[PDB]
């Protein structure tokens, strides 16, 4: 499976039907025929493959890193300091795109689960989604295509400088 903290669901609910008819229920006949025709040979196939790979194993590890300090603690030129700093920043940009992908997956999940009961029990996800995407719009958006890391720093200085000057002369 996965981590149900990070890919959560609402709890499952199933109601019990109750005929009120005496046909009785042809789809029950068909799902029992499906179970006995299909579900047992598929289970035997996966069980054989389970044993055949349960003989011997491999492994793989998720790659982790150290931390280079920052771009701001490199000098004017620093060809080999900025290299580490900017590739670390670009890997953060990659993992951050995938964070936005995961949050949009959650939003689509709440849309398709709740049916037409949207605005009850999905406003939490739209709220946190507009939160995280307002952060992304503020930070990574208007930096063009030849981003390295330095334009992000210039946009950062520009944004906090404009907000500081606005709140100072309106304070």
């Amino acid at each position: 499976s996965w981590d149900k903290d990070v890919y959560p669901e609402p709890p499952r609910r199933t109601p019990a039907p109750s005929p009120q008819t005496s046909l009785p229920n042809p789809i029950t006949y068909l799902t029992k025929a499906f179970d006995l025709l299909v579900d047992r040979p598929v289970t035997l196939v996966r069980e054989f493959i389970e044993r055949q790979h349960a003989k011997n194993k491999y492994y793989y590890y998720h790659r982790e890193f150290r931390r280079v300090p920052d771009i701001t603690e490199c000098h004017e030129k620093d060809v080999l300091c900025m290299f580490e700093a900017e590739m670390q920043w670009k890997r953060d940009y990659k993992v951050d795109q995938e964070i936005v992908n995961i949050i949009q997956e959650r939003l689509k999940a709440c849309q398709q689960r709740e049916g037409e009961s949207h605005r009850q029990n999905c406003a939490k996800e739209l709220q946190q989604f507009t939160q995280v995407v307002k952060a992304y719009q503020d930070r990574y958006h208007d930096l063009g295509a030849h981003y390295s890391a330095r334009k992000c720093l210039a946009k950062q200085k520009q944004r906090m400088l404009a907000e500081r000057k606005a709140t100072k002369e309106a304070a």
Partner: protein, 119 residues
């Protein structure tokens, strides 16, 4: 550059050249010159209507020997010339300190950049 050993007028290499290493075996530039010598032998067989890649093998080996030898001496003089250029440059670096100031390398915490966001 103007000499700067405008004393010995055609000293092809001084004892100053006998302190840097000579061009080594199988350096790629002398191998390029040897391939050019083989190409010269190929085209010399081509012009005189004798069969190309045939019947001129002493001339092939002669051209290869001559071009490898001349290119070897040219590489030696070349490396000496760049070495004396570098050494005179560093002598003028170490000579006058104050015309070459260490620029105070401000880190990016305070170096402002005009941004102009492109859309």
């Amino acid at each position: 550059m103007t000499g700067r050993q405008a004393r010995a007028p055609l000293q092809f290499l001084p004892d100053e050249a006998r302190s840097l290493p000579p061009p080594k075996l199988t350096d790629p530039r002398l191998a390029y010159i040897g391939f050019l010598g083989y190409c010269s032998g190929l085209i010399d067989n081509a012009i005189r209507r004798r069969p190309v890649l045939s019947a001129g093998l002493h001339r092939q080996f002669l051209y290869i020997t001559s071009f490898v030898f001349v290119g070897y001496y040219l590489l030696k003089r070349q490396d000496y010339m760049y070495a004396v250029r570098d050494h005179d440059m560093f002598s003028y670096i170490k000579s006058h300190p104050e015309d070459f100031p260490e620029k105070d390398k401000k880190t990016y915490r305070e170096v402002f950049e005009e941004f102009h966001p492109v859309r």
